Amino acid sequence: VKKFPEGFLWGVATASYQIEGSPLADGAGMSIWHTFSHTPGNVKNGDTGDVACDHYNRWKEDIEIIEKLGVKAYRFSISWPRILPEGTGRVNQKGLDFYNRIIDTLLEKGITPFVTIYHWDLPFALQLKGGWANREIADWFAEYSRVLFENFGDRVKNWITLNEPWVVAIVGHLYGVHAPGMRDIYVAFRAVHNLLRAHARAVKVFRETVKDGKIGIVFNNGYFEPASERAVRFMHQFNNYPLFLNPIYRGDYPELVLEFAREYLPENYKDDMSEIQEKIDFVGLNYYSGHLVKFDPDAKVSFVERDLPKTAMGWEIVPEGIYWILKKVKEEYNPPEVYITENGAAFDDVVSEDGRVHDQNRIDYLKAHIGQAWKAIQEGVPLKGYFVWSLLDNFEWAEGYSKRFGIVYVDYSTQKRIVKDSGYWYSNVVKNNGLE
C-alpha cells in the first residue's frame, strides 16, 4: 500500500468564474472574464461563464457531493467583483453572504476551506484603470484582501493570494488568450512585478488581521526536458515557481529570466524586492504535463512533440513530473509546507447506457501522480495536501465547455451531476488515506 501521513488533506478544487454562473446576480460588478468571454472570437463556441455549473444556486448540493465522497478539504475562489463591484470602495453584503453560506456549510460538514483570493476574475472597473499593469493594484488588492480577512478570517484559516500569476501575466497580457486579452511584452512583465507586490501587500495585511491563520500562493509548473545535449533551465525559471519564489525567498528574479526580460521590467524594480520578501506559510504547486524543449533561434525556445499519450487538451501525460517538481522546490527554496493545489486531466467523457462515466483514463492519470506525490513524501518533502482539479466539469477558460476535468460529470442541459468512476475511485483513496 501507499499510506499518506496522519492528517494529510485530501481535496478537490474549483474556481468562481468556472463554476458559479450568475456573474451579475445580487449587485455583482462585471469581471474581465465576463467582458472577454462576451467578446466574439475569444472563447471556443462563444461559450461564457453566464451559467456554467449554476453553482451560484446549486452550491449546497455540490458541497453535499464533497461530503458524500468524504473529501476533507475544498479549494474554491472568491469573485472579487461580487465583493467589491467597483474593485475598491463599496462592499456588497450579498456577495459576502454567498461565500459565508458556503464557508459555514463546509465547516458544519468538517471540510477544510482553502480560499483562493484571486483566480483571474479581476473587476472590470479596475481593468479600465489598467488592471495588473497599474502599480496601484497592490493597494487595490490589499484593500480587497483586507475585506476578506475581516469578514471570513474568524472561520477560514488557510488562504491563497494568487492562483497561477504566470498565467495571469503572460497568458492574459502577452499571449492574449486569456482576459484581459493583451499582447504587449512590457505590460506582461509589469503585471508579473505587480502581482508580486500585490501578493506581498496582502500577506502583510493578513499578519495584522488574521493572527491565527496561514497564507501562501499557487504556481503552475511543467516538467521540462531537453531534446538533445539550458532552454530547459530557462523554461523552469520562467514558466515554473522560480519566477515568483526567487523574488519571495531571494529578492530578485531568476538569472535566465533577467537575461530574457530585464528590458521589460520596471527600471527600478529592485526597490520593491525587500517588500516582496514578506514571509509565506506555504507554497501550492500545480502540475499536469511535461514538455520536450529545444533551443530554436526562430523567446528562443520551442516544444518538440513526443509520441507519448496525451489528454484531450493534447497535454503529454508525464507523471514523474509531479515528483520532480516537489523535489526541486524543497531543493531550491525549502518552503516549510507544500500542497499540490491542482492536478487533473481532461478526457472525452461520455455517460454509458448503464448511467455511469467510465473514465478509467482519468483514474490512471490520478493514480500515477498521487503515487509520485507519495514518493516525494517518503523522501522528506513536506507535502501536506493534494487537490484534484476539478470537483466538477466546468468552464475551461478559452476552451469553454468542450473540456471536462471533473471527477463529477455535469450535464449542462439539465445541470445533473453524475459522479464519475474517477470520483468513486478517489473517494476510496481519501477514506483509506492513500493507494493500494
Phi, psi of 408 (to 5 degrees): -125, 120
The contacts of residue 128 (CB under 8 Å, 6+ apart) are none
> Which cell is 370 given?
498521487
Length in residues, the chain: 436
Q: Which of 164, 278, 316, 396 is catalytic?
A: 164
Domain count, the chain: 1
Distances from the Cα of 330 to the Cα of 13, 245, 283, 334, angstroms:
24, 12, 10, 4
Distances from the Cα of 73 to the Cα of 14, 309, 337, angstroms:
12, 30, 16
Distance of alpha carbon 92 from alpha carbon 372, whole angstroms: 43
280: domain CATH number is: 3.20.20.80
Q: Which of 20, 278, 316, 342 is catalytic?
A: 342
| Opening angle at CA 39, ends 33 and 43, nearest 5 | 70
164 flagged as catalytic: yes
Closest CA to 95 of 185, 158, 35, 29: 29
Domain of 248, in residue numbers: 1-436
Distance of alpha carbon 95 from alpha carbon 82, whole angstroms: 5
Please indicate the experimental technique that yielded this structure: X-ray
Q: How many CB atoms lie within 10 A of CB 98?
A: 23
Answer yes or no: are the C-beta atoms of 175 and 191 closer than 8 Å: no
86 flagged as catalytic: no
